[PDB]
Design a protein around this ligand. Sequence first.
Ligand SMILES: *[C@@H]1O[C@H](CO)[C@@H](O[C@@H]2O[C@H](CO)[C@@H](O[C@@H]3O[C@H](CO[C@H]4O[C@H](CO)[C@@H](O)[C@H](O)[C@@H]4O)[C@@H](O)[C@H](O[C@H]4O[C@H](CO)[C@@H](O)[C@H](O)[C@@H]4O)[C@@H]3O)[C@H](O)[C@H]2NC(C)=O)[C@H](O)[C@H]1NC(C)=O
Ligand SMILES: *[C@@H]1O[C@H](CO)[C@@H](O[C@@H]2O[C@H](CO)[C@@H](O[C@@H]3O[C@H](CO[C@H]4O[C@H](CO)[C@@H](O)[C@H](O)[C@@H]4O)[C@@H](O)[C@H](O[C@H]4O[C@H](CO)[C@@H](O)[C@H](O)[C@@H]4O)[C@@H]3O)[C@H](O)[C@H]2NC(C)=O)[C@H](O)[C@H]1NC(C)=O
Ligand SMILES: *[C@@H]1O[C@H](CO)[C@@H](O[C@@H]2O[C@H](CO)[C@@H](O[C@@H]3O[C@H](CO[C@H]4O[C@H](CO)[C@@H](O)[C@H](O)[C@@H]4O)[C@@H](O)[C@H](O[C@H]4O[C@H](CO)[C@@H](O)[C@H](O)[C@@H]4O)[C@@H]3O)[C@H](O)[C@H]2NC(C)=O)[C@H](O)[C@H]1NC(C)=O
Ligand SMILES: *[C@@H]1O[C@H](CO)[C@@H](O[C@@H]2O[C@H](CO)[C@@H](O[C@@H]3O[C@H](CO[C@H]4O[C@H](CO)[C@@H](O)[C@H](O)[C@@H]4O)[C@@H](O)[C@H](O[C@H]4O[C@H](CO)[C@@H](O)[C@H](O)[C@@H]4O)[C@@H]3O)[C@H](O)[C@H]2NC(C)=O)[C@H](O)[C@H]1NC(C)=O
Ligand SMILES: *[C@@H]1O[C@H](CO[C@@H]2O[C@@H](C)[C@@H](O)[C@@H](O)[C@@H]2O)[C@@H](O[C@@H]2O[C@H](CO)[C@@H](O)[C@H](O)[C@H]2NC(C)=O)[C@H](O)[C@H]1NC(C)=O
Ligand SMILES: CC(=O)N[C@H]1[C@H]([C@H](O)[C@H](O)CO)O[C@@](OC[C@H]2O[C@@H](O)[C@H](O)[C@@H](O)[C@H]2O)(C(=O)O)C[C@@H]1O
Ligand SMILES: CC(=O)N[C@H]1[C@H]([C@H](O)[C@H](O)CO)O[C@@](OC[C@H]2O[C@@H](O)[C@H](O)[C@@H](O)[C@H]2O)(C(=O)O)C[C@@H]1O
Ligand SMILES: CC(=O)N[C@H]1[C@H]([C@H](O)[C@H](O)CO)O[C@@](O)(C(=O)O)C[C@@H]1O
Ligand SMILES: CC(=O)N[C@H]1[C@H]([C@H](O)[C@H](O)CO)O[C@@](O)(C(=O)O)C[C@@H]1O
Ligand SMILES: *[C@@H]1O[C@H](CO)[C@@H](O)[C@H](O)[C@H]1NC(C)=O
Ligand SMILES: *[C@@H]1O[C@H](CO)[C@@H](O)[C@H](O)[C@H]1NC(C)=O
Ligand SMILES: *[C@@H]1O[C@H](CO)[C@@H](O)[C@H](O)[C@H]1NC(C)=O
Ligand SMILES: *[C@@H]1O[C@H](CO)[C@@H](O)[C@H](O)[C@H]1NC(C)=O
Ligand SMILES: *[C@@H]1O[C@H](CO)[C@@H](O)[C@H](O)[C@H]1NC(C)=O
Ligand SMILES: *[C@@H]1O[C@H](CO)[C@@H](O)[C@H](O)[C@H]1NC(C)=O
Ligand SMILES: *[C@@H]1O[C@H](CO)[C@@H](O)[C@H](O)[C@H]1NC(C)=O
Ligand SMILES: [Ca+2]
Ligand SMILES: [Ca+2]
Ligand SMILES: [Ca+2]
Ligand SMILES: [Ca+2]
Ligand SMILES: [Ca+2]
Lengths: 388, 388, 388, 388
Amino acid sequence: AEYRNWSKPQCDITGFAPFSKDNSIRLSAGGDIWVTREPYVSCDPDKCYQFALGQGTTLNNVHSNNTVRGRTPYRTLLMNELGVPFHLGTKQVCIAWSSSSCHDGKAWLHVCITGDDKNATASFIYNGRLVDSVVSWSKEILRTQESECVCINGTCTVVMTDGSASGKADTKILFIEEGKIVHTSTLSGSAQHVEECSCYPRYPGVRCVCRDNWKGSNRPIVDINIKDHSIVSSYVCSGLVGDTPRKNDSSSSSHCLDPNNEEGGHGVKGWAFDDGNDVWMGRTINETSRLGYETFKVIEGWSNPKSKLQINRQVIVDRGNRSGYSGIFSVEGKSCINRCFYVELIRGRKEETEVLWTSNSIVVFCGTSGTYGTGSWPDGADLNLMPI
Amino acid sequence: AEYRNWSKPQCDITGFAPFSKDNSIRLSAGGDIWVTREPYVSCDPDKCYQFALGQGTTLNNVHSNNTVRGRTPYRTLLMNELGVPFHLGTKQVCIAWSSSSCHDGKAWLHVCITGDDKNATASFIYNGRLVDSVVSWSKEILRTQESECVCINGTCTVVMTDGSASGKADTKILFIEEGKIVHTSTLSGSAQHVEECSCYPRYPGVRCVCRDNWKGSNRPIVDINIKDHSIVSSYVCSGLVGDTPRKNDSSSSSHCLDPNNEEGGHGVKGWAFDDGNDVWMGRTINETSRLGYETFKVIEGWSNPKSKLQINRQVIVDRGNRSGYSGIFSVEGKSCINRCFYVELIRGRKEETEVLWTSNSIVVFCGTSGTYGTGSWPDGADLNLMPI
Amino acid sequence: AEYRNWSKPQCDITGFAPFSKDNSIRLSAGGDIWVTREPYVSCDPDKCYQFALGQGTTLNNVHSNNTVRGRTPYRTLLMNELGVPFHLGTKQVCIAWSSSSCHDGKAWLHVCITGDDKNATASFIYNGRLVDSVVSWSKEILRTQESECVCINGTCTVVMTDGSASGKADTKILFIEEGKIVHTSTLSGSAQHVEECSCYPRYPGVRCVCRDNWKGSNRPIVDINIKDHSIVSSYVCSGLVGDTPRKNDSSSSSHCLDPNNEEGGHGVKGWAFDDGNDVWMGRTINETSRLGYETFKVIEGWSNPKSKLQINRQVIVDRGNRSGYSGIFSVEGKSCINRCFYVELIRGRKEETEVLWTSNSIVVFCGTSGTYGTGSWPDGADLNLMPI
Amino acid sequence: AEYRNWSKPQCDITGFAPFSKDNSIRLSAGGDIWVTREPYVSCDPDKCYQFALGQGTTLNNVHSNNTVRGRTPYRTLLMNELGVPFHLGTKQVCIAWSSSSCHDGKAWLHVCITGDDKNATASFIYNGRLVDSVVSWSKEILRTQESECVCINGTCTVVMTDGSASGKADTKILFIEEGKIVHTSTLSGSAQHVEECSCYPRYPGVRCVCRDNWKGSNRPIVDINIKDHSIVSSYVCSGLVGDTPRKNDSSSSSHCLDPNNEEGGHGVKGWAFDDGNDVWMGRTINETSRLGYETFKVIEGWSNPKSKLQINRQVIVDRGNRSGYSGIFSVEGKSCINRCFYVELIRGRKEETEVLWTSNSIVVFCGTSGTYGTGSWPDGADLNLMPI
Ligand SMILES: *[C@@H]1O[C@H](CO)[C@@H](O[C@@H]2O[C@H](CO)[C@@H](O[C@@H]3O[C@H](CO[C@H]4O[C@H](CO)[C@@H](O)[C@H](O)[C@@H]4O)[C@@H](O)[C@H](O[C@H]4O[C@H](CO)[C@@H](O)[C@H](O)[C@@H]4O)[C@@H]3O)[C@H](O)[C@H]2NC(C)=O)[C@H](O)[C@H]1NC(C)=O
Ligand SMILES: *[C@@H]1O[C@H](CO)[C@@H](O[C@@H]2O[C@H](CO)[C@@H](O[C@@H]3O[C@H](CO[C@H]4O[C@H](CO)[C@@H](O)[C@H](O)[C@@H]4O)[C@@H](O)[C@H](O[C@H]4O[C@H](CO)[C@@H](O)[C@H](O)[C@@H]4O)[C@@H]3O)[C@H](O)[C@H]2NC(C)=O)[C@H](O)[C@H]1NC(C)=O
Ligand SMILES: *[C@@H]1O[C@H](CO)[C@@H](O[C@@H]2O[C@H](CO)[C@@H](O[C@@H]3O[C@H](CO[C@H]4O[C@H](CO)[C@@H](O)[C@H](O)[C@@H]4O)[C@@H](O)[C@H](O[C@H]4O[C@H](CO)[C@@H](O)[C@H](O)[C@@H]4O)[C@@H]3O)[C@H](O)[C@H]2NC(C)=O)[C@H](O)[C@H]1NC(C)=O
Ligand SMILES: *[C@@H]1O[C@H](CO)[C@@H](O[C@@H]2O[C@H](CO)[C@@H](O[C@@H]3O[C@H](CO[C@H]4O[C@H](CO)[C@@H](O)[C@H](O)[C@@H]4O)[C@@H](O)[C@H](O[C@H]4O[C@H](CO)[C@@H](O)[C@H](O)[C@@H]4O)[C@@H]3O)[C@H](O)[C@H]2NC(C)=O)[C@H](O)[C@H]1NC(C)=O
Ligand SMILES: *[C@@H]1O[C@H](CO[C@@H]2O[C@@H](C)[C@@H](O)[C@@H](O)[C@@H]2O)[C@@H](O[C@@H]2O[C@H](CO)[C@@H](O)[C@H](O)[C@H]2NC(C)=O)[C@H](O)[C@H]1NC(C)=O
Ligand SMILES: CC(=O)N[C@H]1[C@H]([C@H](O)[C@H](O)CO)O[C@@](OC[C@H]2O[C@@H](O)[C@H](O)[C@@H](O)[C@H]2O)(C(=O)O)C[C@@H]1O
Ligand SMILES: CC(=O)N[C@H]1[C@H]([C@H](O)[C@H](O)CO)O[C@@](OC[C@H]2O[C@@H](O)[C@H](O)[C@@H](O)[C@H]2O)(C(=O)O)C[C@@H]1O
Ligand SMILES: CC(=O)N[C@H]1[C@H]([C@H](O)[C@H](O)CO)O[C@@](O)(C(=O)O)C[C@@H]1O
Ligand SMILES: CC(=O)N[C@H]1[C@H]([C@H](O)[C@H](O)CO)O[C@@](O)(C(=O)O)C[C@@H]1O
Ligand SMILES: *[C@@H]1O[C@H](CO)[C@@H](O)[C@H](O)[C@H]1NC(C)=O
Ligand SMILES: *[C@@H]1O[C@H](CO)[C@@H](O)[C@H](O)[C@H]1NC(C)=O
Ligand SMILES: *[C@@H]1O[C@H](CO)[C@@H](O)[C@H](O)[C@H]1NC(C)=O
Ligand SMILES: *[C@@H]1O[C@H](CO)[C@@H](O)[C@H](O)[C@H]1NC(C)=O
Ligand SMILES: *[C@@H]1O[C@H](CO)[C@@H](O)[C@H](O)[C@H]1NC(C)=O
Ligand SMILES: *[C@@H]1O[C@H](CO)[C@@H](O)[C@H](O)[C@H]1NC(C)=O
Ligand SMILES: *[C@@H]1O[C@H](CO)[C@@H](O)[C@H](O)[C@H]1NC(C)=O
Ligand SMILES: [Ca+2]
Ligand SMILES: [Ca+2]
Ligand SMILES: [Ca+2]
Ligand SMILES: [Ca+2]
Ligand SMILES: [Ca+2]
């Protein structure tokens, strides 16, 4: 049982093939399911696990009312094997209203954040025990990735941000070894605002496509060297921009170094990855609202901020159906590292007033070298008929 | 952990002994059980699993209305250990409205089909990761076995069909190594229409008894050659024929190479297997609708299309109770390979109107060289008393 | 892994200490619990498992009505780890309205009987596969232990009976190796009528204490030589008798060789085992119906039919609460073989009319060489308050 | 598989970081959850489990009325992995209205106590089998820790008590090897009343901080030597006292050798451990009720009975929210033994009269050598809306 090095070439990708769906909300209309948001997927060397931030309630439960609030003391990080819905026998791995997790090849690491808005604690749990913890540094809603962290040769990296959701905030990259924070680097380079990174192994370092909640509707890239703890940052060149909200396809623009100052305020967790000078990326179909989800390859979109040339569009979720967050994760094949992605399908408040609650289901696709068709895999539930 | 070969002779069979019963519908009247159809059974070297395509819903649930619909974005392949009903902690192992699984002696392969009717994706998931995928090739419902695939020396074979359900169609046989498609042989031989193949190992090959939905109420046999990827095909010779609908024993006839053209349109998944020049097989008792289930040996049924000589009839489900699909699976003993079979006990729509859902339960019987008696093991739910 | 020889002396036993209690019925007034009966405990070399025969329904279910019927085609053998109640997650191992199970030290064998009254089938399932089966031999309810079998050097043995519940019947002892019936020895010796043996290892052989449903309220003993397959049989000498119904303490008598001819009709499954020339035994407290449960030692109970000298009484279930079936199982310590017993606590029909169903819970005790006190541990459910 | 000896230094401790929350009551508002009390956490070498005392019922369940009663024949010890809440799949591991548990590195010991008030039995269950038992020695509610025991080089140790709750009483220290009571020392030294010890491994021996139900608001300390079986005892010097009820922080006083005689009668289980001459300790925030919960360090709190200088306070549960029992457990790190604690959050009767039941949820913190913020993590259930 050795540490993961991720030192294989990236797999060829022609687009994505369906992988998993949990049907969470449809199951809750007739069963006991955890209320959740901020879901994500991560895998040990054998199998993939699904993760979410619980609201310390099930759905057909009085405590469901007001689960739109995203920081309560009852939020726990749930962990099942992938495709096992979050039923009552699901294990709550830590107290977290914000988190991240990764397996280094030997054990699970879990970065968990709970407490008061202005004085939060982040806990680091490795191989089933608490190993370290750190205070909020800027005393303003300390938060992390909401998707998998990445470990290389024993060292795990995680990007955390404390500070304003709409001005310069303070972002750090922690390097954890077996639960212990061994080094902390601060954000450097040109990305002006970073949130909810979707990171992946790009041997010999780590790459992150994040969220800019301030001036940018293009996406910040962050590049972590694991050996000397140096950090560079920039933006996803691509003329077609990953964030929501944003400008429409014709109107939009980007920039390889700065935020585009286009609709920038607010955002969503999303992902992207290089393919030579091309970029594979997903996004909500609608530019303003979290409806629908699509993916495509942008030719020259990693190095040309003028490129708007998309090939291989797939609809994952049709524009009439709600979506949400999304993030990457990497699965090691025999010869190559695959990239896969999960999409959050949010139902309930405040967009939908049919119910009093707010939760999600997920859907998961993995890259493929093979061939694929079409279809739309949305959440499914009829809220007109749900509990109360 | 070595690759399975099934390089053992087929065990003596004097009939079938009772093996397993999930009591799924009766349980779901006072419990939370998945709605499902197209159930099946495959075993790793240790123990047996039950599979079904779920309907992304439980039974006592608003979402269970109209579950008669065969293909939806919400259908997932379920997998419990055999005997474990489909409760909420059941793993969904992939997105699928048609599927097939098998174990190569090292890990599970799952062949999963989901998507648009005219543009469907088949994802190939091996050892808990996605290895390959293919588009629909003839853009008319890409479909597969709905029972176990078969692996020999870590080369797994699966039969897939795309095209009309009542005319010539495009059948291919795939050869999957560690989740990777290494070859696609197209169907050759004298079989005119092939669906839902119940395959089993027959060292050094694989043999399938399928469903002809077009002209034949006999059953196609497809012989796969694992080493040089060649394919021959024909029909099961026996005069008492496998399909439903069909005509009574007095009027029915067969042919070793062609569809019988006797009430051949429409069908049902079923199974058969050779014993020297004799045939073991099961089928519905009612000739036209899927009521009852029975199993027998036809003497010279494997080779002599005039033979109508059955010895060893067992009622499995009596004539007055609903059955459905049924398939073979194989189990390796100390000395030899046993053959077993399950039976889908379909309840609900469109045949029964007391309820709005369509679901199933199952019963499994296994080969025995010992003795046995009689009995009938139906589903046994009272639908008059179920969820409004 | 190695086969169990049980080649260690019986532990010193001063009485019994509390071990396990499942609270089945009480939990079912607010949970989804299986309707069961004919429970029992058996242990693999690490931990113990509980078994019962389910009714194809949960308690809060419409199908729970009339579960006083012992033989339905919906009855499956359930297997959970000891002290895990029979929830919807529970595995059904085989179809059975009668069973026996044991672990040879490498795998589980289960002996499962289902089918028609006049033509039942016994299945022999070993290491998760069906390996043999036998037909009812006298066409009158083929039935077996309803508790653990015993395996010595990988040769397991089990006692089955076919024929009258109130007359001579045909009892046979099967020797099973790796699921395969290698021998069948018919009952021999002075035992006149024999049902539901509570068997235990007693190196170099096995011993059973059974239920005479015909002409004895004393209990049959059967001995089984594992190497030569010979069978001797008699009765539990003790003038204090173990079956129920029976005559009261002052009136009763016994015979080392013959049924006592005392209220001898009917019976109840129960157990005894020898400690030198003394006899440890449990029985219902009330002589004529299945109320309460007690245990004691009879001085000279094993070699004196006129002995009525009890020491070491413990009340397991008090005379106002319902008991039922009860059986032995054995557990290997470092230096000795402990003997333990379970007690079925039945509730519902026919004796209790406040509910429509018939189910049970269990309490379990284990032999102790230490000291102990006193208590009553009944079912504890409130029928006047159960699902109406 | 070697035995644990804990021969490693106590980790640097700056205070506590959040580890786990179970959210149990909130879930039983829409889920089938066990009624519990007296919970606690212990860990094997890999991972942590959570135990609590069931009431032989779930919450939404008519049997939950009256569960303020602490000793019933339906009380069983529960054992899930930590953060997996007590759903219907939870293993009851023994009969017990009082218990302790610990893993010695190879297997689990459970010390389980049930039976009559005046004649309790304590069963000792190791590696999945019953190895011993004792009767109550003074015939007045025999009782043990309700938290982990401690094992060293294969010798485990537990503190037990029999006798008056409000006068002198009979406390013993049992030493257990592989489930066998190998020695019994009786309580010695300054401590006058010893209940519910929270014990930890302080190489080469064991240390416990207990509850004095009689004359003390300061907390008994009991040193256990594991090699020569010697017992000394005293009280927690610190002038800030650990028990509830107590006098306030201005009025209170302690004493290193004797109870303090201050509002002393009654109590609550709690914990403390030494840090050189300082004392880390927790306690309720309210002096006379089990409202709130706080932890702090007292400088010179382990030697100076005049010292009232607290540093590093944390609020675990705010003053207006309920708590209850709280105890310690210890976790072996790479280099050091860490100390963690759990806090029982009791809800319901007789304090809260909106509901008929009495149950609890739980929070768990672990020692950290890093930094932390603040917060509060109460039960958070809404009894005004709960069941009936
Ligand atoms: C079965 O499923 C497959 C795979 O999902 C479908 O094939 C895909 O079709 C999509 C969408 O039409 C393709 O993505 C598109 O690529 C265009 C490229 O245009 C041409 O140029 C290349 C040369 O580089 C030629 O090889 C090729 O023949 C193309 O004609 C882009 O320009 C498209 O972007 C524009 O259209 C989308 C969608 O309408 C807009 O939203 C965008 O904003 C933009 O204006 C688009 O990305 C994809 O590449 C195909 N995949 C594969 C693997 O071939 C089948 O069409 C489908 N069959 C059926 C019946 O549904
Ligand atoms: C207890 O359980 C056993 C085993 O399950 C039952 O015995 C089986 O009974 C079935 C049904 O009768 C037997 O199967 C039948 O075989 C017939 C063979 O014909 C003859 O030839 C052989 C020698 O070559 C003789 O041994 C035999 O006596 C016959 O004279 C077929 O003719 C039957 O098919 C026809 O009957 C059925 C209706 O039963 C129709 O629906 C068919 O369409 C067809 O016309 C049938 O296949 C089977 O062989 C027996 N198995 C064994 C191992 O003996 C017992 O009957 C049962 N006991 C009780 C009391 O129920
Ligand atoms: C705390 O817990 C312990 C252990 O459970 C109890 O001690 C047991 O008590 C029982 C019942 O009282 C004892 O079992 C009885 O033994 C009797 C033997 O009688 C005496 O005579 C012989 C020979 O002269 C002496 O050798 C021996 O020392 C005895 O003093 C039997 O006569 C009893 O059977 C008769 O009475 C019962 C009711 O008790 C009837 O129902 C029977 O049918 C019959 O008439 C019985 O077998 C047992 O031996 C004790 N166990 C141990 C290990 O010592 C404590 O009493 C209990 N304490 C409290 C306060 O409850
Ligand atoms: C974010 O979270 C951190 C960590 O939880 C908080 O820092 C802790 O704050 C608490 C509360 O004030 C501190 O606990 C207190 O320690 C005092 C020690 O006094 C001094 O100690 C030395 C030398 O004198 C100096 O370093 C320091 O400046 C202190 O002034 C005790 O005196 C306190 O006890 C009294 O307070 C409580 C009520 O608050 C009473 O009920 C007590 O009985 C008693 O009268 C108290 O114990 C704690 O030490 C801090 N820990 C650390 C590691 O710094 C931050 O406060 C928080 N930040 C924000 C903005 O909320
Ligand atoms: C059960 O559903 C039927 C049919 O519903 C169809 O399938 C659903 C999943 C969804 O796609 C619906 O829009 C479809 O109608 C319901 O009966 C239909 O109701 C519609 C609108 O109310 C009406 O126009 C038609 O009469 C019905 N459609 C068909 C095809 O028959 C019905 O409401 C449900 N029954 C109950 C008792 O709830
Ligand atoms: C295999 C089987 O059915 N066993 C029964 C058992 C046997 O019938 C008994 O050993 C005689 O052979 O009887 C049990 O019967 C209970 C139930 O059955 C009616 O037939 C009876 O007349 C009623 O009074 C009623 O109690 C038993 O527990 O004694 C159950 C067991 O399943
Ligand atoms: C073994 C047992 O019953 N332990 C109790 C414990 C003991 O009574 C204590 O150690 C003193 O010997 O007390 C606890 O009980 C609280 C409960 O007690 C009733 O008798 C009384 O009516 C009320 O005070 C009621 O709250 C305790 O929490 O202190 C719990 C534990 O189960
Ligand atoms: C830790 C945390 O609170 N995360 C929350 C984010 C952050 O506020 C943004 O990252 C702003 O920085 O906003 C959400 O409403 C959202 O967009 O879905 C909910 C999510 O739970
Ligand atoms: C892939 C798919 O949809 N299969 C469906 C089949 C096909 O229509 C037949 O193979 C004819 O092509 O028909 C069913 O109604 C049936 O017969 O039970 C259900 C099943 O789900
Ligand atoms: C997009 O941009 C602007 C909205 O600011 C609008 O005027 C224009 O019509 C839109 N173009 C398209 C192609 O939708
Ligand atoms: C986004 O939603 C609005 C409706 O609120 C719609 O007008 C707009 O065109 C949508 N964008 C797309 C691409 O459909
Ligand atoms: C399986 O394939 C290998 C090739 O690597 C071959 O050498 C081996 O003998 C094959 N198995 C059998 C039974 O022929
Ligand atoms: C035993 O039962 C008989 C009734 O048949 C009765 O004569 C006798 O009194 C009973 N003995 C006792 C001790 O109750
Ligand atoms: C035996 O059981 C019946 C049940 O109704 C009861 O009436 C009778 O009194 C009991 N006998 C004894 C001796 O307890
Ligand atoms: C604490 O309460 C007691 C009541 O006996 C009293 O001595 C003291 O004044 C109180 N302390 C404070 C600070 O009010
Ligand atoms: C303790 O709890 C009681 C009950 O509500 C409350 O009245 C009292 O004020 C509390 N004491 C303190 C010191 O907060
Ligand atoms: Ca329910
Ligand atoms: Ca933005
Ligand atoms: Ca046909
Ligand atoms: Ca009798
Ligand atoms: Ca006190």
